[PDB]
Amino acid sequence: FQQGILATPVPAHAVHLFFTLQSPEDLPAALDRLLPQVDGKQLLLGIGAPLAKALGREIPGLRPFPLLDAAVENPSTQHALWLWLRGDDRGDLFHRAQALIQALAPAFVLADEVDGFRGYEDGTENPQGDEAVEAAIADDGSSFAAFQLWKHDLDYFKSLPQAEQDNIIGRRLSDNEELDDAPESAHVKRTAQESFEPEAFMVRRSMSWADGRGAGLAFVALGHSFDAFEVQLRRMSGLEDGIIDGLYRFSRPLTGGYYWCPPMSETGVDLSALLR
Amino acid sequence: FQQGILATPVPAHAVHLFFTLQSPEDLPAALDRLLPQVDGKQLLLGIGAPLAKALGREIPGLRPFPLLDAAVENPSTQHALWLWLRGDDRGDLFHRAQALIQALAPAFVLADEVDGFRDGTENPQGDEAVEAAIADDGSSFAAFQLWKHDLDYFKSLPQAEQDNIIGRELDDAPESAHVKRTAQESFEPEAFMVRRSMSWADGRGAGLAFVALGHSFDAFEVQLRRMSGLEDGIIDGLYRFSRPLTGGYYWCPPMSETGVDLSALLR
Ligand code: HEM
Ligand code: HEM
Ligand SMILES: [Cl-]
Ligand SMILES: [Cl-]
Ligand SMILES: [Cl-]
Ligand SMILES: [Cl-]
């Protein structure tokens, strides 16, 4: 598998690029320039349902980000291709991004970009070691990543008394202690990975972001399938018991996408499932 | 029905506001501040599926913007409430917009805003426009898409390729031509709709704010599915230089003698 999915420590910066396929005839030259550069460590690759649909190929486990008909909003903004750049120098990532964007034209056009950088403790409780591989990597070495750009209203959240803030997350801000008497709407009670009848463990690799769209969390959930993320999101959205996650009171996702992260061979990224 | 849906000529400016429901507990007071101001002419109202879901009510004909699993991208960014301001003075519309945004606060947060400014020979007119866009109860069902075009790429193609993408009329144009994909008479239940689109330009780019109003969503949806290649594998040429950034379905409620009629939703 692409080692960057689980490899730690996470670099301080990331650039997420999302592309729309606008000229399918030019796709081979774009892939010829892109794929030798995908090492699964500083450059990771994800494939969206539209690209598989455009090639008449059905990738097992790959589907668009779903449509949840709920009382909260989880938009589906599925794109064809996802590039995940990782590094410690922000300026170097931007120049690498620009070269990759131009390398993918005219086949692809840039549809979205998120610049991630590394007040609760998001991303703990992630599976570790062999359990992280089991949770995030399918048998063939593929992974299935859900991406949501969440926008926060910290003015409203920090205006609440600390007791209500902790009731929304489900843990104390002072020492990150779990609250057993927290309401069922508390976030960690909605996403309790052990609380789903088929356990819903996933590996989260989120980053902070801030641009003209606001500020918040670039949420990334990697699993051996999309099922873990989707059952969790459906419960958060009130589709299981009518109880909505408290997160939606001060935060909302602006984007939503499903991407198949192909396996690595010993010599590079393996797209044989998609290409002949 | 809300008369602004069909009244023509279209004023030079429109402000589309879209809201997300973040505090349902504050919804009754927010609606009490909004509804007396909705006249269906200079301020029109649309209701999204999330708002009905939050109230536990099923509005007949109302559903979220669909998820099209196609080789082109039509995102679903469904919001709870849509305000459609119409007028000739841009500054007056923005001043009204701010007042409405603040009136809906606590309950709603602003999720999206589109500043619209102004062939249509096949758009329904007169009684045919009423028939196409207005349901029996006076409701309408509006599909909204914020399309972003790359006219630099479109005008770089030879003029013949430009004309084959739109279809103009060109009888020998390929089936992928836009006017051949959207021929309202070419759908087995004819797919006539009333279009009320406007141009836009902001930090997201520039293009067309597409608005399709029908007595149900069926006309828009079968057309979009054909445009996306889901009907016969042939994709509309529009997608070669343009793509929608947003997507939403909204139920435009009827008007009573005294104002907008939300009894189906609030009872
Ligand atoms: C604005 C977006 C989000 C923020 C700020 C956020 C923040 C947090 C925080 C503070 C915790 C508690 C500490 C931890 O275990 O990480 C947590 C836990 C968790 N979150 Fe989120 N989260 C967000 C969205 C999501 C979403 C959309 C999912 C969907 C699957 C998710 C899944 C989880 C899981 C699985 C846990 C661990 C639960 C367990 O203990 O088993 N998070 N998150
Ligand atoms: C970037 C977005 C769009 C642009 C720039 C655009 C432009 C055009 C143009 C140039 C025409 C030919 C002249 C005319 O009859 O109006 C046309 C026709 C038409 N388009 Fe679009 N269009 C867009 C999106 C859509 C969408 C999304 C739909 C339906 C879901 C649609 C439905 C129609 C219909 C019904 C006609 C009537 C003429 C015919 O089909 O023969 N348009 N449009
Ligand atoms: Cl290819
Ligand atoms: Cl091996
Ligand atoms: Cl574009
Ligand atoms: Cl064709």
XYZ file of C-alpha atoms and ligand atoms in Angstrom:
633
model
C 0.000 0.000 0.000
C 0.948 3.669 -0.310
C 2.988 4.036 2.876
C 2.005 7.678 3.427
C -1.505 6.537 4.389
C -0.248 5.309 7.775
C 3.341 6.582 8.021
C 4.109 8.821 11.000
C 5.133 11.455 11.984
C 2.809 13.397 9.677
C 4.699 16.231 7.929
C 3.754 19.741 8.978
C 2.102 20.632 5.655
C -0.078 19.017 3.008
C -1.556 20.149 -0.303
C -4.715 18.368 -1.452
C -5.498 18.785 -5.152
C -8.723 17.618 -6.792
C -9.153 17.377 -10.551
C -12.052 17.141 -12.988
C -11.607 15.064 -16.148
C -12.417 17.409 -19.039
C -10.524 15.864 -21.999
C -10.544 12.042 -21.868
C -8.589 11.823 -25.143
C -5.560 13.415 -23.438
C -5.674 11.110 -20.398
C -2.856 8.698 -21.460
C -0.223 11.441 -21.726
C -1.335 12.882 -18.377
C -1.034 9.494 -16.665
C 2.330 8.881 -18.349
C 3.625 12.070 -16.705
C 1.882 11.586 -13.342
C 2.259 7.933 -12.375
C 6.106 7.688 -12.241
C 5.956 10.528 -9.683
C 3.537 8.760 -7.307
C 5.683 7.284 -4.529
C 2.900 6.861 -1.966
C 4.917 8.899 0.556
C 5.357 12.536 -0.507
C 2.801 12.188 -3.324
C -0.279 10.009 -2.839
C -2.942 9.283 -5.445
C -6.680 8.719 -5.227
C -9.132 7.783 -7.963
C -12.733 8.965 -8.028
C -15.804 7.252 -9.434
C -16.124 9.663 -12.428
C -12.710 8.592 -13.740
C -13.616 4.903 -13.483
C -16.972 5.681 -15.109
C -15.185 7.533 -17.925
C -13.062 4.455 -18.708
C -15.966 2.005 -18.490
C -14.237 0.295 -15.558
C -15.885 -0.765 -12.296
C -13.429 -0.631 -9.386
C -14.590 -2.950 -6.566
C -15.495 -0.844 -3.550
C -15.400 2.483 -5.418
C -18.512 4.662 -5.504
C -19.296 8.386 -5.274
C -19.566 10.170 -1.961
C -23.132 9.331 -0.892
C -26.242 11.486 -0.638
C -27.524 11.535 2.953
C -31.143 12.736 3.066
C -30.852 14.047 6.620
C -31.632 17.135 8.689
C -27.954 18.129 8.369
C -25.949 18.813 5.224
C -23.151 16.563 3.942
C -22.553 17.703 0.356
C -21.326 15.347 -2.352
C -18.658 17.070 -4.445
C -17.078 14.040 -6.102
C -14.097 14.630 -8.396
C -12.130 12.354 -10.709
C -8.642 12.431 -9.184
C -7.039 13.335 -5.854
C -3.396 14.263 -5.272
C -2.143 14.356 -1.674
C 1.222 16.115 -1.320
C 3.108 15.815 1.973
C 6.147 17.763 3.123
C 7.596 20.091 5.731
C 8.184 23.136 3.478
C 4.989 24.939 2.469
C 6.648 26.812 -0.398
C 8.098 23.639 -1.906
C 4.669 21.976 -1.835
C 3.084 24.825 -3.799
C 5.716 24.637 -6.546
C 5.390 20.849 -6.651
C 1.614 21.313 -6.855
C 1.877 23.786 -9.749
C 4.088 21.412 -11.746
C 1.639 18.559 -11.140
C -1.369 20.700 -12.106
C 0.287 21.632 -15.400
C 1.430 18.030 -15.878
C -2.184 16.822 -15.744
C -3.572 19.310 -18.259
C -5.292 19.368 -20.724
C -6.733 16.037 -19.543
C -7.671 17.315 -16.072
C -8.620 20.741 -14.756
C -8.086 21.708 -11.123
C -11.451 21.697 -9.341
C -10.454 22.236 -5.700
C -7.394 22.751 -3.507
C -6.942 22.520 0.264
C -3.728 23.594 2.006
C -3.454 21.677 5.274
C -1.176 22.407 8.218
C -0.608 20.640 11.526
C -9.159 23.619 20.323
C -9.546 19.930 21.107
C -7.228 16.986 20.380
C -8.455 15.750 17.018
C -7.216 12.468 15.566
C -6.311 10.498 18.681
C -7.801 7.013 19.298
C -6.656 6.068 15.786
C -5.749 2.379 15.384
C -2.014 1.781 15.634
C 0.520 -0.709 14.330
C -0.930 -3.781 12.660
C -4.438 -2.679 13.662
C -4.027 0.492 11.588
C -3.102 -1.625 8.554
C -6.112 -3.870 9.188
C -8.485 -0.917 9.583
C -7.278 1.125 6.597
C -5.782 -1.243 3.986
C -7.696 -3.772 1.904
C -6.205 -7.180 1.104
C -4.825 -6.021 -2.264
C -3.108 -3.019 -0.664
C -5.797 -0.527 -1.659
C -7.346 2.016 0.673
C -10.627 3.911 0.440
C -10.490 7.527 1.607
C -13.359 9.870 2.470
C -12.536 13.583 2.342
C -14.588 16.375 3.921
C -13.589 20.032 4.279
C -15.239 21.020 7.569
C -15.707 24.723 8.357
C -15.916 25.799 12.001
C -17.616 28.700 13.771
C -15.263 28.913 16.750
C -16.845 32.227 17.776
C -20.043 30.326 18.587
C -18.315 27.269 20.059
C -16.048 29.156 22.473
C -18.955 31.444 23.410
C -20.659 28.444 25.008
C -19.879 27.613 28.649
C -17.095 25.061 28.959
C -19.585 22.445 30.180
C -21.610 22.720 26.965
C -18.453 22.698 24.825
C -17.366 19.453 26.492
C -20.868 18.016 26.070
C -20.654 18.624 22.309
C -17.364 16.746 21.915
C -17.844 14.321 24.803
C -14.469 14.898 26.485
C -12.988 17.479 28.826
C -10.941 20.244 27.234
C -8.640 20.317 30.275
C -7.293 16.748 30.182
C -9.109 15.051 27.247
C -10.931 12.800 29.723
C -13.874 10.859 28.312
C -17.306 11.817 29.665
C -19.485 8.779 30.356
C -22.487 10.917 31.365
C -22.173 12.910 28.131
C -25.324 13.068 25.979
C -25.743 10.575 23.159
C -25.314 13.512 20.750
C -21.707 13.989 21.909
C -19.266 13.475 19.046
C -17.189 10.672 20.575
C -20.422 8.878 21.483
C -21.681 9.172 17.900
C -18.383 7.911 16.451
C -17.561 5.200 19.020
C -15.885 2.747 16.647
C -16.697 -0.180 18.953
C -20.398 0.757 19.190
C -21.320 -0.393 15.659
C -22.525 -3.965 15.206
C -19.852 -4.498 12.546
C -17.137 -2.457 14.254
C -16.397 0.731 12.329
C -12.674 1.343 12.812
C -10.921 3.756 10.454
C -7.636 5.670 10.321
C -8.096 9.449 10.487
C -5.430 11.757 9.018
C -6.902 15.246 9.368
C -5.238 18.664 9.118
C -6.208 22.247 9.845
C -6.953 24.640 6.989
C -7.678 28.343 6.544
C -8.413 30.380 3.416
C -11.163 32.588 1.978
C -13.734 29.848 2.624
C -13.160 30.082 6.394
C -11.252 27.840 8.774
C -11.628 24.348 10.171
C -10.620 20.708 9.753
C -9.694 18.935 6.517
C -11.111 15.550 7.502
C -9.597 12.416 5.937
C -10.838 8.931 6.877
C -9.047 5.917 5.385
C -10.489 2.413 5.557
C -10.270 -0.965 3.885
C -13.692 0.073 2.565
C -15.955 3.107 2.833
C -18.347 1.281 5.178
C -16.797 2.478 8.452
C -16.886 6.160 7.480
C -20.369 5.892 5.988
C -22.094 4.180 8.925
C -20.464 6.706 11.259
C -21.528 9.667 9.110
C -25.082 8.317 8.875
C -25.302 8.045 12.666
C -23.815 11.526 13.062
C -26.480 12.777 10.638
C -29.351 11.381 12.725
C -30.242 8.661 10.206
C -29.854 5.878 12.798
C -31.802 7.135 15.832
C -32.811 10.711 14.972
C -30.024 12.038 17.226
C -27.682 14.444 15.431
C -24.010 14.863 16.305
C -23.330 18.010 18.319
C -20.529 18.887 15.879
C -23.149 20.120 13.395
C -24.129 22.871 15.853
C -20.911 24.800 15.107
C -19.315 23.040 12.112
C -20.383 21.824 8.691
C -18.672 20.098 5.746
C -18.288 22.191 2.596
C -17.104 19.294 0.400
C -17.355 15.519 0.208
C -15.462 12.928 -1.807
C -14.693 9.208 -2.031
C -11.373 8.099 -3.500
C -9.776 4.716 -4.153
C -6.091 4.818 -3.218
C -4.495 2.155 -5.456
C -1.871 -0.255 -4.103
C 1.857 0.066 -4.636
C 3.936 -2.486 -6.469
C 7.636 -2.874 -5.745
C 8.271 -0.500 -8.677
C 5.498 2.090 -8.293
C 1.776 2.691 -8.033
C -0.428 -0.116 -9.376
C -3.388 1.078 -11.474
C -3.850 -2.231 -13.330
C -7.366 -2.521 -11.898
C -8.275 0.658 -13.822
C -5.911 0.481 -16.824
C -5.326 -2.621 -18.960
C -47.993 31.141 -7.118
C -45.054 33.416 -6.327
C -45.415 35.782 -9.270
C -41.679 36.464 -9.564
C -41.211 32.884 -10.795
C -42.607 33.750 -14.231
C -42.801 37.554 -14.401
C -40.806 39.003 -17.301
C -38.708 40.906 -18.289
C -36.245 39.637 -15.688
C -34.818 42.522 -13.617
C -31.174 43.331 -14.222
C -29.957 41.905 -10.898
C -30.651 38.976 -8.608
C -29.172 37.865 -5.294
C -29.519 34.178 -4.446
C -28.974 33.334 -0.778
C -28.725 29.786 0.556
C -28.905 28.945 4.249
C -27.977 25.975 6.418
C -30.073 25.207 9.497
C -27.640 25.072 12.424
C -29.927 25.751 15.426
C -33.358 24.147 14.893
C -34.447 25.396 18.324
C -34.364 28.968 16.965
C -36.260 28.137 13.758
C -39.766 29.359 14.797
C -38.631 32.899 15.642
C -36.487 33.052 12.492
C -39.435 32.119 10.270
C -41.634 34.636 12.106
C -39.118 37.324 11.115
C -38.771 36.103 7.513
C -42.245 35.179 6.289
C -44.015 38.595 6.524
C -41.325 39.923 4.145
C -41.791 37.268 1.422
C -44.011 38.747 -1.299
C -43.064 36.278 -4.046
C -42.140 39.185 -6.339
C -39.053 41.036 -5.079
C -38.295 38.319 -2.485
C -38.987 34.674 -3.344
C -38.633 31.664 -1.055
C -37.541 28.090 -1.638
C -37.567 25.212 0.826
C -34.939 22.480 0.819
C -35.165 18.833 1.823
C -32.977 19.256 4.975
C -35.460 21.772 6.392
C -38.378 19.384 5.845
C -36.312 16.581 7.401
C -35.566 18.775 10.420
C -39.315 19.339 10.877
C -40.176 15.670 10.306
C -42.396 16.589 7.353
C -42.528 14.995 3.902
C -43.304 17.624 1.255
C -44.796 15.961 -1.860
C -42.376 16.364 -4.748
C -39.514 17.653 -2.575
C -36.270 15.667 -2.450
C -32.545 16.488 -2.387
C -30.603 17.256 -5.521
C -29.761 13.759 -6.803
C -26.444 11.917 -6.954
C -25.578 11.165 -10.587
C -22.931 8.430 -10.872
C -21.655 9.610 -14.248
C -18.405 10.377 -16.066
C -19.114 14.095 -15.533
C -19.515 15.933 -12.243
C -22.847 17.301 -10.994
C -22.325 17.961 -7.277
C -25.135 17.875 -4.731
C -24.834 20.795 -2.310
C -28.355 20.779 -0.902
C -29.170 23.522 1.604
C -32.180 24.140 3.831
C -33.578 27.428 2.518
C -33.281 29.571 -0.609
C -33.977 33.308 -0.856
C -34.284 34.815 -4.343
C -34.096 38.616 -4.436
C -34.991 40.424 -7.673
C -34.469 44.081 -8.518
C -32.863 46.660 -10.771
C -30.596 48.240 -8.122
C -27.718 46.007 -7.036
C -27.043 48.056 -3.905
C -30.673 47.859 -2.802
C -30.646 44.065 -3.188
C -27.480 43.665 -1.102
C -28.871 45.941 1.617
C -32.024 43.808 1.747
C -29.856 40.667 1.665
C -27.948 41.703 4.803
C -31.189 42.425 6.674
C -32.537 38.989 5.729
C -29.286 37.230 6.678
C -29.378 38.841 10.122
C -33.094 38.068 10.523
C -32.451 34.341 9.907
C -29.432 34.214 12.282
C -29.389 32.030 15.269
C -31.487 29.534 13.267
C -29.693 29.767 9.904
C -26.157 30.491 8.731
C -25.405 31.719 5.214
C -24.010 28.794 3.203
C -23.818 30.252 -0.313
C -24.476 33.484 -2.177
C -24.693 34.135 -5.915
C -24.775 37.632 -7.394
C -26.565 37.271 -10.718
C -26.752 39.859 -13.470
C -28.422 39.914 -16.872
C -31.371 32.261 -26.352
C -34.643 31.638 -24.563
C -36.592 31.268 -27.813
C -37.666 27.812 -26.616
C -38.542 28.974 -23.101
C -42.276 28.523 -22.388
C -44.370 31.692 -22.436
C -47.759 32.776 -21.158
C -50.102 29.982 -20.128
C -47.567 27.402 -21.332
C -45.054 28.767 -18.815
C -47.669 28.449 -16.059
C -48.379 24.861 -17.118
C -44.685 23.931 -17.274
C -43.559 25.524 -14.003
C -46.520 25.677 -11.581
C -48.138 22.688 -9.886
C -51.880 22.545 -9.234
C -51.537 23.946 -5.702
C -49.466 26.892 -6.967
C -46.121 25.444 -5.903
C -43.024 25.319 -8.083
C -39.924 23.123 -7.916
C -36.619 24.809 -8.735
C -33.263 23.265 -9.620
C -30.247 25.519 -9.070
C -26.742 24.927 -10.445
C -23.800 27.343 -10.341
C -21.962 26.529 -13.577
C -18.336 27.603 -14.074
C -17.167 27.920 -17.685
C -13.742 28.298 -19.299
C -14.564 30.572 -22.232
C -10.823 30.939 -22.858
C -10.736 27.236 -23.729
C -14.037 27.348 -25.632
C -13.051 30.241 -27.904
C -9.643 28.627 -28.497
C -11.356 25.788 -30.360
C -12.145 26.318 -34.058
C -15.544 27.894 -34.640
C -16.865 24.629 -36.104
C -16.129 22.760 -32.865
C -17.752 25.550 -30.849
C -20.916 25.223 -32.941
C -20.965 21.423 -32.622
C -20.807 21.756 -28.829
C -23.853 24.036 -28.623
C -25.630 22.756 -31.737
C -26.168 26.095 -33.512
C -29.518 25.519 -35.838
C -27.307 22.618 -36.979
C -29.178 19.478 -38.029
C -25.982 17.505 -38.724
C -24.627 18.328 -35.263
C -23.706 15.284 -33.148
C -26.148 13.984 -30.557
C -23.760 15.354 -27.906
C -24.664 18.918 -28.929
C -26.338 20.803 -26.091
C -29.555 21.682 -27.934
C -29.851 18.036 -29.010
C -29.374 16.783 -25.441
C -31.932 19.231 -24.023
C -34.566 19.163 -26.795
C -37.597 19.457 -24.515
C -39.800 17.662 -27.060
C -37.335 14.752 -27.380
C -38.164 13.237 -23.963
C -40.935 10.646 -23.796
C -42.753 12.691 -21.163
C -41.860 16.030 -22.725
C -39.443 17.853 -20.460
C -40.490 21.486 -20.659
C -39.250 23.777 -17.904
C -39.010 27.520 -17.339
C -35.398 28.679 -17.193
C -34.484 31.824 -15.255
C -30.688 31.846 -15.449
C -28.274 34.724 -14.855
C -24.586 35.413 -15.376
C -22.236 35.450 -12.398
C -18.615 36.247 -11.577
C -16.785 36.161 -8.241
C -13.742 34.517 -6.647
C -14.970 31.093 -7.796
C -14.771 32.147 -11.461
C -17.501 33.099 -13.913
C -20.376 31.414 -15.699
C -24.140 30.851 -15.608
C -26.310 30.596 -12.493
C -28.753 28.062 -13.919
C -32.327 28.049 -12.583
C -34.901 25.560 -13.893
C -38.454 25.793 -12.536
C -41.034 23.075 -13.115
C -44.273 21.740 -11.696
C -41.970 18.949 -10.501
C -38.263 18.156 -10.666
C -38.867 15.486 -13.328
C -38.205 17.704 -16.363
C -34.857 19.015 -15.090
C -33.694 15.634 -13.810
C -34.299 13.564 -16.946
C -32.555 16.284 -18.969
C -29.560 16.369 -16.622
C -29.303 12.572 -16.682
C -29.245 12.631 -20.487
C -26.666 15.435 -20.436
C -24.520 13.299 -18.111
C -24.549 10.287 -20.442
C -26.724 8.204 -18.110
C -29.433 7.731 -20.768
C -27.519 6.713 -23.909
C -23.823 7.026 -22.993
C -23.546 10.324 -24.907
C -22.311 13.235 -22.771
C -23.342 16.834 -23.419
C -20.611 18.900 -25.062
C -21.133 21.581 -22.399
C -19.026 19.483 -20.014
C -15.981 19.992 -22.264
C -15.670 23.628 -21.139
C -18.144 24.040 -18.252
C -19.125 22.210 -15.075
C -21.520 22.920 -12.191
C -19.973 23.878 -8.867
C -23.207 23.503 -6.857
C -26.544 21.716 -7.036
C -29.841 22.198 -5.232
C -33.541 21.306 -5.292
C -36.038 23.716 -3.754
C -39.805 23.716 -3.298
C -41.214 27.194 -3.927
C -44.388 27.314 -1.790
C -47.631 28.872 -3.047
C -48.865 32.324 -2.120
C -52.043 32.946 -0.172
C -54.021 36.174 -0.396
C -51.918 37.432 2.540
C -48.454 35.987 1.877
C -46.455 32.833 1.300
C -48.260 29.618 2.254
C -46.071 27.257 4.298
C -48.968 25.328 5.866
C -47.780 22.120 4.183
C -44.498 22.426 6.120
C -45.562 23.950 9.461
C -49.263 22.975 9.706
C -15.339 19.257 12.130
C -15.010 17.969 12.019
C -14.464 17.121 13.193
C -13.808 17.493 14.308
C -13.362 18.913 14.725
C -13.545 16.296 15.086
C -12.886 16.228 16.297
C -12.788 15.091 17.073
C -12.395 15.008 18.468
C -12.002 16.171 19.400
C -12.436 13.728 18.831
C -12.081 13.175 20.225
C -10.607 12.790 20.263
C -10.308 11.728 19.238
O -10.540 10.529 19.522
O -9.857 12.083 18.119
C -12.841 12.936 17.690
C -12.998 11.567 17.676
C -13.407 10.792 16.618
N -13.933 11.271 15.436
Fe -14.030 13.257 14.941
N -14.078 15.218 14.407
C -14.651 15.688 13.246
C -15.297 14.940 12.289
C -15.397 13.569 12.240
C -16.119 12.811 11.241
C -16.901 13.414 10.055
C -15.983 11.510 11.515
C -16.618 10.382 10.665
C -16.274 9.097 10.799
C -15.168 11.394 12.717
C -14.768 10.245 13.367
C -14.223 10.188 14.630
C -13.859 8.986 15.348
C -14.017 7.548 14.810
C -13.371 9.343 16.540
C -12.864 8.380 17.640
C -14.067 7.768 18.354
C -13.633 6.644 19.259
O -13.142 6.935 20.380
O -13.785 5.458 18.866
N -14.832 12.673 13.124
N -13.054 13.805 16.636
C -23.169 26.381 -18.222
C -24.478 26.112 -18.258
C -25.346 26.270 -19.530
C -25.150 27.061 -20.603
C -24.006 28.069 -20.863
C -26.242 26.834 -21.527
C -26.418 27.458 -22.745
C -27.420 27.175 -23.647
C -27.487 27.600 -25.033
C -26.444 28.462 -25.774
C -28.614 27.115 -25.560
C -29.098 27.312 -27.014
C -30.058 28.491 -27.126
C -31.324 28.288 -26.335
O -32.277 27.680 -26.884
O -31.391 28.745 -25.165
C -29.305 26.363 -24.536
C -30.505 25.708 -24.697
C -31.171 24.957 -23.755
N -30.593 24.478 -22.596
Fe -28.823 25.180 -21.787
N -27.080 25.882 -20.981
C -26.562 25.511 -19.757
C -27.106 24.581 -18.896
C -28.297 23.906 -19.063
C -28.814 22.858 -18.203
C -28.070 22.346 -16.948
C -29.998 22.455 -18.702
C -30.992 21.375 -18.201
C -30.820 20.614 -17.114
C -30.258 23.242 -19.889
C -31.372 23.137 -20.691
C -31.553 23.772 -21.898
C -32.781 23.819 -22.662
C -34.118 23.160 -22.261
C -32.561 24.517 -23.779
C -33.657 24.787 -24.843
C -33.180 24.743 -26.294
C -33.020 23.330 -26.783
O -32.836 22.413 -25.942
O -33.069 23.125 -28.022
N -29.206 24.112 -20.081
N -28.547 26.422 -23.383
Cl -5.904 5.778 -20.531
Cl 4.354 -8.888 -1.498
Cl -14.207 24.946 -15.894
Cl -22.144 12.061 -30.400
